[PDB]
Scaffold this active site. Structure first.
Site, PDB file in Angstrom:
ATOM      1  N   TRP A  83      36.367  45.037  48.990  1.00 21.52           N
ATOM      2  CA  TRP A  83      35.626  43.880  49.503  1.00 21.52           C
ATOM      3  C   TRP A  83      34.305  44.240  50.199  1.00 21.52           C
ATOM      4  O   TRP A  83      33.595  43.363  50.700  1.00 21.52           O
ATOM      5  CB  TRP A  83      36.516  43.079  50.450  1.00 21.52           C
ATOM      6  CG  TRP A  83      37.432  42.167  49.705  1.00 21.52           C
ATOM      7  CD1 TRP A  83      38.753  42.352  49.436  1.00 21.52           C
ATOM      8  CD2 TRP A  83      37.068  40.921  49.112  1.00 21.52           C
ATOM      9  NE1 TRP A  83      39.248  41.273  48.705  1.00 21.52           N
ATOM     10  CE2 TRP A  83      38.223  40.395  48.482  1.00 21.52           C
ATOM     11  CE3 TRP A  83      35.866  40.209  49.030  1.00 21.52           C
ATOM     12  CZ2 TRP A  83      38.212  39.166  47.802  1.00 21.52           C
ATOM     13  CZ3 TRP A  83      35.854  39.009  48.360  1.00 21.52           C
ATOM     14  CH2 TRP A  83      37.025  38.494  47.750  1.00 21.52           C
ATOM     15  N   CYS A 169      38.832  33.307  44.090  1.00 20.88           N
ATOM     16  CA  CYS A 169      39.122  33.464  42.660  1.00 20.88           C
ATOM     17  C   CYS A 169      40.523  32.944  42.413  1.00 20.88           C
ATOM     18  O   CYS A 169      40.750  32.204  41.460  1.00 20.88           O
ATOM     19  CB  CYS A 169      39.057  34.926  42.204  1.00 20.88           C
ATOM     20  SG  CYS A 169      37.552  35.895  42.608  1.00 20.88           S
TER      21      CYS A 169
HETATM   22  C1  LIG Z   1      37.674  37.661  42.200  1.00 21.51           C
HETATM   23  C2  LIG Z   1      38.745  38.074  43.032  1.00 21.51           C
HETATM   24  F1  LIG Z   1      38.667  37.916  44.389  1.00 21.51           F
HETATM   25  C3  LIG Z   1      38.667  39.619  43.038  1.00 21.51           C
HETATM   26  N1  LIG Z   1      37.482  40.471  43.300  1.00 21.51           N
HETATM   27  C4  LIG Z   1      37.189  40.849  44.679  1.00 21.51           C
HETATM   28  C5  LIG Z   1      37.023  42.354  44.800  1.00 21.51           C
HETATM   29  N2  LIG Z   1      38.192  42.965  44.230  1.00 21.51           N
HETATM   30  C6  LIG Z   1      38.123  44.193  43.697  1.00 21.51           C
HETATM   31  C7  LIG Z   1      36.911  44.885  43.679  1.00 21.51           C
HETATM   32  C8  LIG Z   1      36.864  46.167  43.143  1.00 21.51           C
HETATM   33  C9  LIG Z   1      38.023  46.730  42.612  1.00 21.51           C
HETATM   34  C10 LIG Z   1      38.069  48.113  42.044  1.00 21.51           C
HETATM   35  O1  LIG Z   1      37.060  48.818  42.035  1.00 21.51           O
HETATM   36  N3  LIG Z   1      39.320  48.442  41.703  1.00 21.51           N
HETATM   37  C11 LIG Z   1      39.927  49.735  41.400  1.00 21.51           C
HETATM   38  C12 LIG Z   1      40.133  49.957  39.901  1.00 21.51           C
HETATM   39  C13 LIG Z   1      41.162  48.943  39.418  1.00 21.51           C
HETATM   40  C14 LIG Z   1      42.625  49.175  39.775  1.00 21.51           C
HETATM   41  O2  LIG Z   1      43.179  50.279  39.892  1.00 21.51           O
HETATM   42  O3  LIG Z   1      43.290  48.143  39.923  1.00 21.51           O
HETATM   43  C15 LIG Z   1      39.292  50.922  42.066  1.00 21.51           C
HETATM   44  O4  LIG Z   1      38.106  50.862  42.456  1.00 21.51           O
HETATM   45  O5  LIG Z   1      40.016  51.930  42.205  1.00 21.51           O
HETATM   46  C16 LIG Z   1      39.227  46.040  42.643  1.00 21.51           C
HETATM   47  C17 LIG Z   1      39.281  44.765  43.184  1.00 21.51           C
HETATM   48  C18 LIG Z   1      35.876  40.139  45.002  1.00 21.51           C
HETATM   49  N4  LIG Z   1      34.836  40.318  43.991  1.00 21.51           N
HETATM   50  C19 LIG Z   1      35.115  40.638  42.716  1.00 21.51           C
HETATM   51  C20 LIG Z   1      36.525  40.765  42.311  1.00 21.51           C
HETATM   52  C21 LIG Z   1      36.758  41.124  40.888  1.00 21.51           C
HETATM   53  O6  LIG Z   1      37.905  41.269  40.427  1.00 21.51           O
HETATM   54  N5  LIG Z   1      35.698  41.317  40.088  1.00 21.51           N
HETATM   55  C22 LIG Z   1      34.430  41.195  40.529  1.00 21.51           C
HETATM   56  N6  LIG Z   1      33.418  41.409  39.655  1.00 21.51           N
HETATM   57  N7  LIG Z   1      34.133  40.869  41.809  1.00 21.51           N
HETATM   58  C23 LIG Z   1      40.121  38.055  42.445  1.00 21.51           C
HETATM   59  O7  LIG Z   1      41.092  38.107  43.235  1.00 21.51           O
HETATM   60  N8  LIG Z   1      40.267  38.112  41.111  1.00 21.51           N
HETATM   61  C24 LIG Z   1      39.203  38.069  40.291  1.00 21.51           C
HETATM   62  O8  LIG Z   1      39.386  38.194  39.056  1.00 21.51           O
HETATM   63  N9  LIG Z   1      37.911  37.853  40.831  1.00 21.51           N
HETATM   64  C25 LIG Z   1      36.796  37.919  39.880  1.00 21.51           C
HETATM   65  C26 LIG Z   1      36.466  36.784  38.947  1.00 21.51           C
HETATM   66  C27 LIG Z   1      34.977  37.016  38.742  1.00 21.51           C
HETATM   67  O9  LIG Z   1      34.673  38.044  37.764  1.00 21.51           O
HETATM   68  C28 LIG Z   1      34.518  37.485  40.104  1.00 21.51           C
HETATM   69  C29 LIG Z   1      34.143  36.310  40.988  1.00 21.51           C
HETATM   70  O10 LIG Z   1      32.927  35.751  40.462  1.00 21.51           O
HETATM   71  P1  LIG Z   1      32.702  34.157  40.398  1.00 21.51           P
HETATM   72  O11 LIG Z   1      31.263  34.125  39.883  1.00 21.51           O
HETATM   73  O12 LIG Z   1      33.754  33.679  39.415  1.00 21.51           O
HETATM   74  O13 LIG Z   1      32.784  33.594  41.809  1.00 21.51           O
HETATM   75  O14 LIG Z   1      35.620  38.192  40.670  1.00 21.51           O
END
Ligand SMILES: *C1=[C@](F)([C]N2[C]([C][N]C3=[C][C]=C(C(=O)[N][C]([C][C]C([O])=O)C([O])=O)[C]=[C]3)[C][N]C3=C2C(=O)[N]C([N])=N3)C(=O)[N]C(=O)N1[C]1[C][C]([O])[C]([C]OP([O])([O])=O)O1
Ligand SMILES: CN1c2c(nc(N)[nH]c2=O)NC[C@@H]1CNc1ccc(C(=O)N[C@@H](CCC(=O)O)C(=O)O)cc1
Ligand SMILES: *c1c(F)c(=O)[nH]c(=O)n1[C@H]1C[C@H](O)[C@@H](COP(=O)(O)O)O1
Lengths: 287, 287
Positions: A83, A169
């Site tokens: 992150w 996501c």
């Molecule tokens: C979104 C989400 F939240 C996830 N993600 C985060 C971060 N995570 C990660 C990063 C990096 C990595 C690596 O590198 N890994 C490993 C290889 C493989 C294994 O073993 O398992 C190492 O290095 O060792 C891991 C994890 C925040 N951002 C991002 C992500 C991804 O995946 N991709 C990207 N390009 N970025 C979740 O939970 N899931 C998913 O799938 N996601 C995605 C969808 C898309 O492509 C992005 C967002 O954009 P929008 O425009 O749609 O808002 O992401």
């Protein structure tokens, strides 16, 4: 058949029948809209074997969600850097968040799961007693009224979206109980098939094992639903290598003591047993 | 081949492999967790043909959602009584809403779609400009950045759940653009296969036609995802009758003038063309 074959068939379907679709990161993708897989959790744990998955990252990331954190750097202290890119000075500045501290992802997963509807200030603020503790509500409902059809934890919060470094996501999940078994379905709006999706599968399987443990149920299924399921253009060749690999039987997950509340789980409580993956495949993250 | 076969196969699957699961209404169900179907919207419209579906109900209900109404009486006044039971005096009283006027469903779909995060008072309050207009934001995003992977409208609002007569069955939807086509995926937490689900399929197909019209796109697919997919015990016999019937080709939906905004659509703007259903099948609603 082996549950991993579902993931591999999804990857192949996107390679073969996916459409070229540009994206936010500028990387480019092949994309399909709408997929579903079902991974059994019954005496097996769906940690993919066709590459070595960073299980420590999965485990630490989930504990970090559970504790309500929105500070990427708290995760980074564990040697889990996943992150960092989306919390960086440059990335936050690119979104116009020039005033907040590096690592402050905004009101993302941890905050929504434990304090939905509270007023976000910064990652350091004290939100105790504020908002809806969806995670605890889910657990309580499973314990007391398992037939309930509203057992949902939703990180999607339209009001808070503009403050988030990256909107969730994994947007919403639902739990279900029948025949003494706990199942979970994830609605994932956006799935990076190469990096995120293998993590997401393991993460929600692990969460289900955790909740099953504290509610005295057996893990059932993890149903994985995808919206935009995509392969980044720089993952095509790595994934074509992966697709030729024969899965090994999935490992098992053991929980090593009786844990009474979701907040009391620690990394030391878990053991993955019989994990025999193929080698790591390097894939670059799209920022 | 025929898209309706997916619905019929889902029904057959629940009858054959579903587990008996008790429920809120006291009716009982056969239930499966996690299903997905894909209904093409290309030169046809998925209004089921193995029974006559109450299209006027689908159309009025959706316009009622779009205008932000949470008053069942406003829908009832159009001759569409489907929400009356869940807004009735007895139903409201059962949940503790002893002071609430009959018809007031609380902060359900219409409110969440147009005013997410606003403070609900009652169904007759003016919420203009309050909260997040998710529906307009969806439309704007499709027009300005069709590749966006966050094009979501979510009625699930954890903070407002306690005030709702019935938490959203159709919890979250996501839109997607590729190949000049607008697709929609619905995450439906709970599907009454006999009554609600045929309405939900037509409703989201219709909404997708409306938004495609406004945004200069062609309708693509409606991807229907289910959580708790169930057959009420008193729908078993009617659905078995339905399962013996061969689908007819789906009808088409025509939009009869150029409409520039989502709020300007009226009942008279739509025509279902070539609808040839089998006879109505009566099914009683579980309260
Ligand atoms: C979104 C989400 F939240 C996830 N993600 C985060 C971060 N995570 C990660 C990063 C990096 C990595 C690596 O590198 N890994 C490993 C290889 C493989 C294994 O073993 O398992 C190492 O290095 O060792 C891991 C994890 C925040 N951002 C991002 C992500 C991804 O995946 N991709 C990207 N390009 N970025 C979740 O939970 N899931 C998913 O799938 N996601 C995605 C969808 C898309 O492509 C992005 C967002 O954009 P929008 O425009 O749609 O808002 O992401
Ligand atoms: C989705 N909904 C729903 C529910 N409750 C249950 N048990 N099932 C549902 O599907 N509560 C809220 C909402 C109500 N929607 C509906 C939709 C249709 C009908 C219904 O009775 N339809 C009949 C006849 C309608 C008519 O022709 O007048 C049908 O045959 O479709 C009832 C409630
Ligand atoms: C509710 C609706 F509003 C809808 O649009 N579609 C549906 O299928 N339903 C169904 C699902 C279920 O049978 C009931 C709601 O009951 P709970 O799941 O809240 O107990 O209506």
């Amino acid at each position: 058949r082996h549950g991993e074959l579902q993931y591999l068939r999804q990857v192949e379907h996107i390679l073969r029948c996916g459409f070229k679709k540009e994206d936010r990161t500028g990387t480019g993708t092949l994309s399909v809209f709408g997929m579903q897989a079902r991974y059994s959790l019954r005496d097996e744990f769906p940690l993919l074997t066709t590459k070595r998955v960073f299980w420590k990252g999965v485990l630490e990331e989930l504990l970090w969600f559970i504790k309500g954190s929105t500070n990427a750097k708290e995760l980074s202290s564990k040697g889990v850097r996943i992150w960092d890119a989306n919390g960086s000075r440059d990335f936050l500045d690119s979104l116009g968040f020039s005033a907040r501290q590096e690592g402050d992802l905004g009101p993302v997963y941890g905050f929504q799961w434990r304090h939905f509807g509270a007023e976000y200030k910064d990652m350091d603020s004290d939100y105790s007693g504020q908002g809806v503790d969806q995670l605890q509500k889910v657990i309580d409902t499973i314990k007391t009224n398992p037939d309930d059809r509203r057992i949902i934890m939703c990180a999607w919060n339209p009001k808070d979206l503009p403050l988030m470094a990256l909107p969730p996501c994994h947007a919403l999940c639902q739990f279900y109980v029948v025949n003494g078994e706990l199942s979970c379905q994830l609605y994932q709006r956006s799935g990076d098939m190469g990096l995120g999706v293998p993590f997401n599968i393991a993460s929600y399987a692990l969460l289900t094992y955790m909740i099953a443990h504290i509610t005295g149920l057996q893990p059932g299924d993890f149903v994985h639903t995808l919206g935009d399921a995509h392969i980044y253009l720089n993952h095509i060749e790595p994934l074509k290598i992966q697709l030729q690999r024969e899965p090994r039987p999935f490992p098992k997950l053991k929980i090593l003591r009786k844990v009474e509340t979701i907040d009391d789980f620690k990394v030391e409580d878990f053991q993955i047993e019989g994990y025999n993956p193929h080698p790591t495949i390097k894939m670059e993250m799209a920022v």
